[model samples]
Target: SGKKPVKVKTPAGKEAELVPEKVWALGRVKIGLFKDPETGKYFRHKLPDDYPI
Candidate 1:
């Protein structure tokens, strides 16, 4: 059960590994990443309202 490592830089410009099935809030993009930053674990399900029905 080996998962590939994805590299992402931290706010301090440090290298960090992105774990699969992990979600968080940060990084400006088209669809903003939103999650329980306090929870510190698990990804969010369900699409945003912006998405067409």
Candidate 2:
């Protein structure tokens, strides 16, 4: 992926205080998926995969 600036905000509405250029340079990698017991579904973070429960 190419370099681009990004702004990230906290759930509590606080500024992250991290530089966009630096954050993107670090990059992100996915290890595995987590399953939700209540709905019997898998998700990346809070986003559901495929059909909704």
Candidate 3:
């Protein structure tokens, strides 16, 4: 796996690269970070039914 460290930005227009494989909240259901291979970026995948963070 030659996944080099490429520069990327988040959905919020923040500079970023790596993204967590998964996420969970204590006794709470929510969405979290996700990857964008097309843009080679990561985003805090927030939704109407989830918390923004």
Candidate 4:
């Protein structure tokens, strides 16, 4: 698949796409912290293949 960028609202109240970069993980749960290159903002997501207990 291609880049699955997540949509986020900017300070200007505009919607834009952000590409998540892998950061760290804990046990079976993994977290992805992505930074908006344009605004240096932060966003997070979980591992796509992981499940919660």
Off by over 4 Å in 3: 1-20, 26-29, 47-53
| Model 2 segments more than 4 A misplaced | 1-26, 29-32, 46-53
Q: Against the hidden true structure, what lDDT does model 1 obtain?
A: 0.36
Model 4: residues >4 Å from true position, as ranges? Answer: 1-17, 37-39, 50-53
How do the predictions measure up, each by TM-score? 0.28, 0.26, 0.36, 0.39
lDDT of 4 by residue, 1-53 (tens): 33456565555567767655654556666655667577787766554543221
Instruction: Report the number of the highest-lDDT candidate.
Output: 4
Ranking by TM-score: 4, 3, 1, 2
The pairs that clash in candidate 2 are none
**Which tens-of-lDDT digit does each residue in 1-53 have in candidate 3?**
33323344566576655544455453455545568756766565432234332
In terms of lDDT, model 3 sits at 0.50
lDDT of each: 0.36, 0.30, 0.50, 0.58
Question: Whole-model lDDT for model 4 versus the true structure?
Answer: 0.58
Please say which candidate is ahead in lDDT: 1 or 4. 4
Error of 3 at 5 (Å): 24
Q: Is candidate 3 or candidate 4 better by TM-score?
A: 4
